[model samples]
Target: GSSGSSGEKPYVCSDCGKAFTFKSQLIVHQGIHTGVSGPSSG
Candidate 1:
């Protein structure tokens, strides 16, 4: 499902607007901003 032809990233952080290729990646990346090292409840 990844369109590797272009630099199109749909997953973005609501806090800092950082982009990622996957939604789950962004969720994990947000952990750093939220003061956690990784996803806790998963």
Candidate 2:
């Protein structure tokens, strides 16, 4: 049997210390960092 399952997510947000599965998704999430203060504020 071969080891094929890469179940770990590599993309992490620098601003909020969040984790993501895909690179594109990480970029999209970063937008929120620039758009608003955060969930606690707005």
Candidate 3:
């Protein structure tokens, strides 16, 4: 399991050239870059 370690910056997005500390965060972040909306109430 990829977890946050001290000063560890893993998980990178090839499309936007962004880096993240955790894979889970990166996964959600990709949605932002792709303009895909998740559960939202409006």
Candidate 4:
């Protein structure tokens, strides 16, 4: 199981108290932070 912590919060956003499970996912989330719109946005 992926229970252990990575000891890194690379996916954290300072503007919003949001955390991600992966760095790549955080990068993608940043696009949303920038107010960008995509087809079927979250």
Candidate 5:
């Protein structure tokens, strides 16, 4: 299921006022607020 009637660039970071192409990237941007690094492979 997809909304083909609109663009996909919708996720925006409220703290930074930046738009991310994907939600996953938005979560990474949130890390800046908490000084937390993104998840890494182990």
Candidate 6:
């Protein structure tokens, strides 16, 4: 219940406007903001 229009992906990030599946996933994705997900992108 996160997608819209064509029904592609649901769950949108409140900060960066990202999409996700389950709300729980947003919690994990939030790491990108706080930079606590671990491992460097480089």
Please tell me which predicted candidate would have the highest TM-score against the true structure. 2
Clashes of each: 0, 0, 0, 0, 0, 2
Minimal lDDT window, size 10, model 5: 33-42
lDDT measured at residue 2 in model 6 versus the true structure, 0 to 100: 41
Candidate 2 least-lDDT 10 residues: 33-42
> What is the alpha-carbon lDDT for the whole of candidate 2?
0.83
Task: Name the TM-score of candidate 4.
Answer: 0.48
Which residue ranges in model 6 land beyond 4 Å of their true spot? 1-6, 36-42
Which lDDT tens digits does candidate 2 get at residues 1-42? 338876667899999888899899999999988766546752
Candidate 1 regions off by >4 Å? 1-5, 36-42
lDDT of 4 by residue, 1-42 (tens): 357866646568765668887888877777776753455544
Whole-model lDDT for model 4 versus the true structure? 0.68
| Candidate 4 clashes between residue pairs 3 or more apart in a chain or in different chains | none
Superior by TM-score: candidate 5 or candidate 6: 5
Best by lDDT: 2
lDDT of 6: 0.76
lDDT of each model, Cα atoms only? 0.78, 0.83, 0.76, 0.68, 0.78, 0.76
Q: On TM-score, who's better, 1 or 2?
A: 2
Residue 34 lDDT in model 5?
87
Cα lDDT tens digits for candidate 3, 1-42: 556765657788876678898899889888877664565573
Candidate 3 contains a number of clashing pairs equal to 0
Candidate 6 clashing pairs, residues 3+ apart or interchain: 2-10, 3-10
lDDT of 1 by residue, 1-42 (tens): 554777778788887677899888988898878665554673
Candidate 2: where is the Cα deviation over 4 Å?
A: 1-7, 38-42
> Rank by lDDT, descending?
2, 5, 1, 6, 3, 4
lDDT of 4 at 22: 85
Better of 1 and 6 by TM-score: 1
TM-score per candidate, chains pooled: 0.57, 0.62, 0.54, 0.48, 0.55, 0.52
